[PDB]
């Protein structure tokens, strides 16, 4: 049973309506199921432990028995009259609301009390590493004590109550074994209150540490089910939400990104220059679109973000072409009639809006750093919005210069300030971008081995690629973490892949002389580096031309392997290299024993 | 370390005590008590 206890308000006959939460002057009795007593007992148990320090310091008020907050009522206990009717409990143990209040504020008040002392006990305890993980190692008690008698700073609490803290301590450190009163010798065994827990944390030499290897697994299992690593290369529309894209604002360096390497950025590849004009704040400036191609951020295929083009440390040659100086650098949109990459001359450019200029010309924004005047780090920045560009077939964001007077000097300059580190930040997660279009769902499998070397590094913050990369990255840490894809152990991961290579290379051999019986020693090893190359750089699985990894099978395969692989690790997964791991722990205890030996001499 | 006597069953400077870690019993109280909503009830 569970929930609050109910009782037949109509008396005797208890039906699915003659019940009612048995409330009263104390609040409502909620049932205390077996396991929920484990907690409140485990919590109180950790407080009772500090008994010797509560009396010493006259705080506290006696040991806290959980049997002081409960009661022994009886009735039907459920979550609702209907279902509570199927849990007739007699003399169960319930805790009334007003009690659920004290057991709370008591464990809270006492928790402070101890939390404090417990902190002093520690700066003194750990102040001599009472924990080794291979074999033993003593340190003659006299010295030890006479030593901490020093180190411990005058405001601890282990100097005001030595054997009032010691008695608390003995129950937390199975290192300190108190000398028995009637034989005046230790005990071999150490009996700290955490008897079992402390036994099951020792780094057992057979397998690393059960508490470790156990969690590193349940931890990975969490992720595997959580983010949705499963279904990682699913071939079908998936809401961007399914990718929980967060804290995702990637930055670049356009005016370098080739147009074909990333759809969201077209260029004005035209013969001559395209000097246009525009009255901005009265003054008339001339946008240039200089000698080179001047790659500009396209506006369509640009998920309403927060574009913030930073222009700093980048050269600013106002020294040579004086034409450049005087011009306030500024991010400006450019609506063109004919599609760009077909826009020849000025009459082609519909209009030009200065979405964000920089007050003060190019001769105050400068700063000489050895001849080559740089740009005082400043951030121009628009706030592009999907629909503010409705209809408008062609429009481009360009972080240019806005020259107040074009001249012969700036005839080979080309004032694109795009060489600066631009940082787009998708401000509306629901919508992603792929191959130049804005969508609401991705098709994972499509984005695999479909980008090129740099059609990946040139991805646009929160676009399929960047999403089908953030995803693999989780799955990449589950294998990297739990599975042993980094040793000659032909693990579950590199194993799922090997079975694909076989089934694959086996049918490609079917029909024709079949002169080559499948290899296997070579297949195991080829798939080992395939699974390994993945854990290594999760990204690669997106680039066209990557051995194994990019065939449709793998990944879809890998994950579902790694999947079941985590759901069976056992507990002693740590047996892997638990030999050198062990031998390394003995190595430490031998060096730490060496320490105790000095504590033992210096302070005799 | 001044002698106490009864407050607690053990004297610190008491006869034949012994600091001596054993890789076998890693000292530990109770920190990870579960209280999260679903798990506490
Ligand atoms: C008398 O108090 C002399 C000092 C000896 C003990 C003071 C505290 C240092 C040793 C701690 C023992 C309890 C757990 C560390």
List the single residue in A145, A176, A193 with the smallest CB-CB distance to B13. Answer: A145
Note whether A525 and A547 are within 8 A (CB): no
Name the domain count of chain B: 1
Q: How far is CA A515 from the centre of its chain?
A: 50
What does the alpha-carbon distance between residue A448 and residue A253 come to, in Å, rounded to a whole number? 25
For an interface test with B, the pick among A178, A183, A193 (most B C-beta atoms closer than 10 Å) comes out as: A178
Q: Do B27 and A33 touch (CB under 8 A)?
A: no
* Ordered DSSP codes for A297-364: EESSS-TTB--EEEE-SSB--TTS-TTTTTPPPEEEEEE-SSPSSS--SGGG--EEEEEEE-SS-TTT
Q: What is the dihedral of CA A83, A84, A85, A89, to 10 degrees?
A: 140
Q: Do A39 and B35 touch (CB under 8 A)?
A: yes
Q: Is the CB of A124 under 6 A from ligand 1?
A: yes
CA neighbor of A460 nearest in space, from A233, A248, A190: A248
Please, which experimental method was used?
Answer: cryo-EM
What does the alpha-carbon distance between residue A51 and residue A44 come to, in Å, rounded to a whole number? 11
Q: Do A39 and B34 touch (CB under 8 A)?
A: yes
What does the alpha-carbon distance between residue A565 and residue A575 come to, in Å, rounded to a whole number? 16
What does the alpha-carbon distance between residue B21 and residue A536 come to, in Å, rounded to a whole number? 40
CA neighbor of B21 nearest in space, from A138, A208, A351: A138
CA neighbor of A243 nearest in space, from A457, A429, A480, A426: A429
DSSP A408: S
Pairing type for strands A378-379 and A238-239 reads: unpaired
Note whether A277 and A285 are within 8 A (CB): yes
What does the alpha-carbon distance between residue A47 and residue A172 come to, in Å, rounded to a whole number? 12
List the single residue in B11, B21, B35 with the smallest CB-CB distance to A131. Answer: B21
**Rg of chain A on CA atoms, in Å:** 36
CA A155 vs CA A87, A112, A151: distances in Å: 55, 18, 11
Write the burial class of residue A357 (CB in 10 Å: 0-12 exposed, 13-18 middle, 19+ buried).
Answer: middle
Contacts of B39 (CB under 8 A, 6+ apart): none
**Rg of chain B on CA atoms, in Å:** 18
What does the alpha-carbon distance between residue A16 and residue A87 come to, in Å, rounded to a whole number? 12
User: Tokens 């459920």 label which residue?
Assistant: A78
What does the alpha-carbon distance between residue A188 and residue A191 come to, in Å, rounded to a whole number? 10
CA neighbor of A444 nearest in space, from A458, A432, A430, A461: A432
Contacts of A245 (CB under 8 A, 6+ apart): A426, A429, A432, A462, A466, A467, A470
A138 contacts chain B (CB < 8 A): yes
User: Ligand 1 centroid vs A180 CA: distance in angstroms?
Assistant: 18
- Residues of chain B whose beta carbon is less than 8 angstroms from a beta carbon of chain A are 1-2, 4, 7-30, 33-35, 40-41
Q: Which domain holds residue B19?
A: 1-41
Q: Is the CB of A44 under 6 A from ligand 1?
A: no
Q: Do B22 and A184 touch (CB under 8 A)?
A: no
Query: What sign does the CA torsion over A579, A583, A584, A588 have?
Result: positive
Note whether A114 and A52 are within 8 A (CB): no
| DSSP reduced 3-state for B37 | helix
User: A198 contacts in B (CB within 8 Å)?
Assistant: 25-28
Query: Would you mind telling me the total number of residues written for chain B in this entry?
Result: 41
What does the alpha-carbon distance between residue A151 and residue A602 come to, in Å, rounded to a whole number? 13
Nearest atom (ligand 1) to Cα of B2: 1
Note whether A404 and A214 are within 8 A (CB): no
Pull the structure tokens for residue A256: 């370098």
Nearest atom (ligand 1) to Cα of A176: 14
Side-chain half-sphere exposure of A57, counting CA atoms within 13 A? 19
A438 contacts chain B (CB < 8 A): no
The CATH superfamily of A209-227+463-577 is Protein mu-1, chain B, domain 3 (1.10.2050.10)
Q: Pick the residue whose CA is nearest to atom 14 on ligand 1.
A: A166
User: B20 contacts in A (CB within 8 Å)?
Assistant: 136-139, 175, 177, 186
List the single residue in B1, B15, B30 with the smallest CB-CB distance to A46. Answer: B30
Contacts of A321 (CB under 8 A, 6+ apart): A407, A409, A410, A413
Contacts of A35 (CB under 8 A, 6+ apart): none
**Residue A407 phi/psi, 5° resolution?**
-140, 175
List the single residue in A133, A134, A164 with the smallest CB-CB distance to B4. Answer: A164
Q: Pick the residue whose CA is nearest to atom 5 on ligand 1.
A: B1
User: Order of strands across the sheet with A295-298?
Assistant: A265-267, A295-298, A395-400, A330-335, A351-357
What does the alpha-carbon distance between residue A315 and residue A151 come to, in Å, rounded to a whole number? 57
List the single residue in B11, B21, B26 with the smallest CB-CB distance to A137. Answer: B21
Note whether A431 and A224 are within 8 A (CB): no
Mutate to test the pocket of ligand 1, among A117, A141, A145 (most ligand atoms within 8 A of CB): A145
User: A587 contacts in B (CB within 8 Å)?
Assistant: none
For residue A89, give how far its alpha carbon lies from the nearest alpha carbon of chain B (Å). 18
Query: Would you mind telling me the total number of residues written for chain A in this entry?
Result: 604
CA neighbor of A374 nearest in space, from A309, A316, A455, A438: A316
Note whether A564 and A106 are within 8 A (CB): no
What does the alpha-carbon distance between residue A78 and residue A3 come to, in Å, rounded to a whole number? 5
A137 contacts chain B (CB < 8 A): yes
What does the alpha-carbon distance between residue A381 and residue A397 come to, in Å, rounded to a whole number? 11
- E-state strands within A125-275: 176-177, 238-239, 265-267
What does the alpha-carbon distance between residue B35 and residue B41 come to, in Å, rounded to a whole number? 8
Record: fold of A237-462: Jelly Rolls (2.60.120)
Q: Is the CB of A152 under 6 A from ligand 1?
A: yes
Q: In which element (H, E) is residue A89 found?
A: strand A88-89
Q: Where are the domains of chain A?
A: 3-200+578-604, 209-227+463-577, 237-462
Query: Residues A281-285: contacts with CB within 8 Å, 24+ apart?
Result: A281/A357, A283/A404, A284/A404, A285/A327, A285/A328, A285/A354, A285/A402, A285/A403, A285/A404
């Amino acid at each position: 049973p569970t929930g609050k206890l109910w009782r037949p308000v109509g008396t005797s006959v208890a039906t699915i309506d003659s019940l009612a939460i048995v409330s009263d002057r104390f609040g409502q009795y909620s049932f205390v199921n077996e396991g929920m007593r484990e907690t409140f007992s485990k919590a109180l148990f950790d407080i009772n432990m500090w008994q010797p320090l509560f009396q010493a310091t006259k705080t506290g008020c006696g040991p806290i028995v959980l049997s002081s907050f409960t009661t022994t009522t009886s009735g039907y206990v459920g979550a609702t009259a209907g279902d509570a009717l199927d849990n007739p409990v007699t003399n169960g143990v319930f805790i009334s609301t007003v009690q659920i209040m004290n057991l709370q504020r008591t464990i809270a008040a006492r928790m402070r009390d101890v939390a404090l002392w417990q902190k002093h006990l520690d700066t003194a305890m750990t102040m001599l590493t009472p924990d080794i993980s291979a074999g033993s190692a003593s340190c003659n008690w006299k010295s030890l004590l006479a030593f901490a008698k020093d180190i411990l700073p005058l405001d601890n609490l282990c100097l005001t109550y030595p054997n009032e803290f010691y008695n608390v301590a003995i129950h937390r450190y199975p290192a300190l074994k108190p000398g028995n009163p009637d034989t005046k010798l230790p005990d071999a065994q150490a009996h700290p209150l955490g008897e079992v827990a402390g036994a099951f944390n020792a780094a057992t030499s057979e397998v690393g540490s059960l508490v470790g290897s156990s969690s590193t697994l349940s931890q990975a299992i969490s992720t595997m089910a959580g983010k949705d690593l499963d279904l990682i290369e699913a071939d079908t529309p998936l809401p961007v939400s399914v990718f929980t894209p967060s804290l995702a604002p990637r930055s670049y360096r356009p005016a370098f990104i080739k147009p074909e390497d990333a759809k969201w950025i077209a260029e004005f590849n035209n013969s001559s220059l395209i000097r246009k004009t525009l009255t901005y704040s009265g003054a008339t400036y001339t946008v240039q679109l200089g000698p080179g191609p001047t790659r500009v951020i396209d506006m369509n295929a640009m998920i309403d973000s927060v574009l913030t083009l930073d222009v700093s440390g980048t050269i600013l040659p106002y020294d040579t072409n004086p034409d450049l100086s005087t011009s306030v650098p500024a991010f400006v949109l450019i609506q063109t009639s004919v599609p760009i990459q077909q826009v020849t001359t000025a009459a082609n450019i519909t209009a030009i809006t200065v979405v964000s200029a920089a007050g003060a010309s190019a001769i105050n924004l400068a700063i000489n750093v050895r001849g080559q005047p740089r740009f005082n780090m400043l951030h121009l920045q628009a706030t592009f919005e999907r629909e503010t560009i409705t209809g408008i077939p062609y429009i481009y964001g360009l972080g240019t210069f806005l020259i107040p007077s074009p001249t012969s000097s700036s005839n080979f300059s080309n004032p694109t300030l795009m060489d600066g580190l631009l940082t787009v930040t998708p401000v509306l997660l629901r919508e992603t971008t792929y191959k130049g279009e804005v969508v609401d769902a991705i098709v994972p499998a499509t984005v695999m081995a479909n980008q090129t070397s740099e059609e990946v590094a040139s991805a646009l913050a929160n676009d399929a690629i960047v999403l089908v990369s953030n995803h693999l990255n989780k799955l990449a840490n589950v294998v990297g973490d739990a599975i042993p894809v980094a040793s000659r152990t032909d693990d579950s991961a590199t194993s799922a892949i090997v079975s694909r290579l076989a089934v694959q290379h086996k049918l490609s051999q079917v029909g024709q002389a079949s002169p080559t019986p499948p290899d296997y020693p070579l297949l195991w090893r080829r798939a080992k580096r395939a699974a390994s190359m993945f854990v290594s750089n999760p990204s690669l699985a997106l680039q066209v031309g990557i051995p194994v990894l990019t065939q449709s099978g793998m990944l879809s395969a890998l994950t579902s392997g790694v999947g079941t692989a985590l759901r069976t690790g056992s507990l002693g997964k740590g047996v892997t290299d638990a030999s050198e791991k062990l031998r390394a722990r003995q190595s430490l205890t031998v060096a730490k024993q060496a320490f105790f030996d000095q504590i033992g001499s210096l302070w005799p | 370390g001044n002698v106490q006597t009864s407050v607690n069953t053990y004297n610190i400077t008491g006869d034949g005590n012994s600091f001596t870690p054993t890789s076998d019993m890693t000292s530990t109280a109770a920190p990870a008590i579960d209280l999260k909503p679903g798990v506490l009830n």
